[PDB]
Write a protein that binds this ligand. Sequence first.
Ligand SMILES: Cc1nn(CC(F)(F)F)cc1Nc1nc(C2CC2)c(-c2cncc3c2ncn3C)nc1C(N)=O
Length: 287
Amino acid sequence: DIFNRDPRDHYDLLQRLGGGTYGEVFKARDKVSGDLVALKMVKMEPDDDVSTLQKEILILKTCRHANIVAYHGSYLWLQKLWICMEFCGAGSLQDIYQVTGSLSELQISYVCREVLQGLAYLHSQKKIHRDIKGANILINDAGEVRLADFGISAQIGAELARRLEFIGTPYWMAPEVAAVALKGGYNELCDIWSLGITAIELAELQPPLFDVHPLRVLFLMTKSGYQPPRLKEKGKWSAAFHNFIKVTLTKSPKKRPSATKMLSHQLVSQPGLNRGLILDLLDKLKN
Ligand SMILES: Cc1nn(CC(F)(F)F)cc1Nc1nc(C2CC2)c(-c2cncc3c2ncn3C)nc1C(N)=O
């Protein structure tokens, strides 16, 4: 499952694509097949024994779904874990919309249906993604939609930095998650709220309150009279899209629908939602 060797023995390392709390990601090519892959270098905590690491790589391998970037293999080299993953040629939805402008309502509907399929799978596996946003939804050259990873729950690498990252950028978290360090916990329904915010982000190029200081957003979201956000231009979007935002952004998690329930919402169950809508979006990159 995990190779005790240099990933460079099986791959040619190419350009660094980006990096964050999840690791450093590079473009790479398989030496034998010639196929493009993404190699992600994750620094390890010296306290995590190889049994702890193996338990997490087994999860990385078994927690599999068509709407989550596929895992190919791993390498333990120089106290670092290199993860080989499916190459998503068009980058994230943020990378795309910061060139193309706002996605169409049908494009957002397709993205939302595909992300809901991935979240319904992760929730069935008793995981909470807790990192849904446009930058963490990747697009391949075929127009397919994939979550970059299964979220923050990997008990390897910079887990603590990943877990606390939203405190400095809380715009996509549900109010029960924004109530950080208070007695109430949260459940998987926080992902449904994050998907509602991501739909507004795809429509408006930023999530609601993006211009507000992160500590002020945390202050506002724990106030009793806090109201969920809405789309800015009412006449630009259909009643179905406004209702999708209304129900995904239900303030109380005890009233917020599940990922499976959301899949029958009119916005994402309508006919004509396919990768061709995203192929049209990728065609806009050329102009
Ligand atoms: C082909 C390409 N282009 N771009 C745009 C850029 F500007 F970075 F180059 C990005 C890619 N590819 C990827 N980039 C990333 C991130 C460096 C941007 C990840 C990635 C992996 N693990 C966790 C992640 C990731 N993203 C967010 N989280 C939480 N994966 C892929 C990929 N599989 O193709």
